[PDB]
Design a protein around this ligand. Structure first.
Ligand SMILES: C#CCN(C)Cc1nc(C2(O)CCNCC2)cs1
Ligand SMILES: C#CCN(C)Cc1nc(C2(O)CCNCC2)cs1
Length: 340
């Protein structure tokens, strides 16, 4: 609305498109780093703390096995992830420093954020007060304003993907489902508790699914548990498509009103997806105390600072079996990953 916001977003889009159209490639190699510790694992990849041998700097290295990426139908998703991360720039997104590939794997070398996942702190404290939840939610609102103005949808908002930095601010990690979308998209993906009804029903869907997921995240931060849950995914999906939501009595009236408009099952009536876009959220009464410019500038004192001893501390992450990073003598899946 204000011309200063319009010109900020226009410059952000110009700088994104220049890097999008000419991506960087092949900017390091594996024997430039020492392996320290496994920080997370999944069905086709893992994340490892590493140290660069010449500079001494620490990084979070995401390692993807090419053969498993193909088998689980993730080729286009992994190419989206790396092409988007090398082109974006925003205070609340983890930065990609290097990328490269070898006979067996794809590598994305990110900044290391030592404070841990928001999920760990939420479960240890029980629930966040409304001011504490609001500080984190404001950073997500600004991040989605940025991403959506570049025609990007994020599609994986949840507490495990939000890391807490040395200042107590959020860094969003894991762009494995992020995509450049000018109209609608159709892939079934995401985590069950956070999916909007139009994903579950196999519709063509848009950026409104990120604003639904922000309603699930704010509910989970302020209550301690998500609004839709069950033992089996089909039962979760039945609750989501009903959209019946019960709120704890300790929620303020302003919080309940915001959540009824983000958790709106009709996508054409959902906040974030109306004529006024993000400003229906930024101007809602639950955000009346938020200084949007001071949050962007990192000038607000955070609700807490994680406890850690230095840039290589891993005490806020958990323990996994330590496995080899094997590189085959023969090249695998070369054609499929030519652009990486
Ligand atoms: C290889 C090959 C030919 N396949 C039909 C290609 C395939 N594409 C998929 C997608 O889910 C990838 C994400 N965009 C939507 C389609 C699954 S299988
Ligand atoms: C708290 C509590 C009680 N549970 C029934 C709550 C639940 N929490 C989950 C999640 O693990 C899903 C993924 N992100 C974080 C929360 C599933 S069911």
């Amino acid at each position: 609305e204000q011309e200063s916001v319009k010109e900020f977003l226009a410059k952000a889009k110009e700088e994104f498109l220049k890097k999008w159209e000419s991506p960087s490639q092949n900017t390091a190699q594996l024997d430039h780093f020492d392996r320290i510790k496994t920080l997370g694992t999944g069905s086709f990849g893992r994340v490892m703390l590493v140290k660069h041998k010449e500079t001494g700097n620490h990084y979070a290295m995401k390692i993807l096995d090419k053969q498993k990426v193909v088998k689980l139908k993730q080729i286009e998703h992994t190419l989206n992830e790396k092409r988007i991360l090398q082109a974006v720039n925003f205070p609340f997104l983890v930065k990609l420093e290097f990328s490269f590939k070898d006979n067996s794997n794809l590598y994305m070398v990110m900044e290391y954020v030592p404070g841990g996942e928001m999920f760990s702190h939420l479960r240890r404290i029980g629930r966040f007060s409304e001011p504490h939840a609001r500080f984190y939610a404001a950073q997500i609102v600004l991040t989605f304003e940025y991403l959506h103005s570049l025609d990007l949808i994020y599609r994986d908002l949840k507490p495990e993907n939000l890391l807490i930095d040395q200042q107590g601010y959020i860094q969003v990690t894991d762009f494995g489902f992020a995509k450049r979308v000018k109209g609608r998209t159709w892939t079934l993906c995401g985590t069950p508790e956070y999916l909007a009804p139009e994903i579950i029903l196999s519709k063509g869907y848009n950026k409104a699914v990120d604003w639904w997921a922000l309603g699930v995240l704010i509910y989970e931060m302020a209550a301690g548990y998500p609004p839709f849950f069950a033992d089996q995914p089909i039962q979760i999906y039945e609750k989501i498509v009903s959209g019946k939501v019960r709120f704890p009595s300790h929620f303020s009236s302003d919080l309940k009103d915001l959540l009824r408009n983000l958790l709106q099952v009709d996508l054409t009536k959902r906040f974030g997806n109306l004529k006024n876009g993000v400003n229906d959220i930024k101007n809602h009464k639950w955000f009346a105390t938020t200084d949007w410019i001071a949050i962007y500038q990192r000038k607000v004192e955070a609700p807490f600072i994680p406890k850690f001893k230095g840039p290589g501390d891993t005490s806020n992450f958990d323990d996994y079996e330590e496995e080899e990073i094997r590189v085959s003598i023969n090249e695998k899946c070369g054609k499929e990953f030519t652009e990486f």
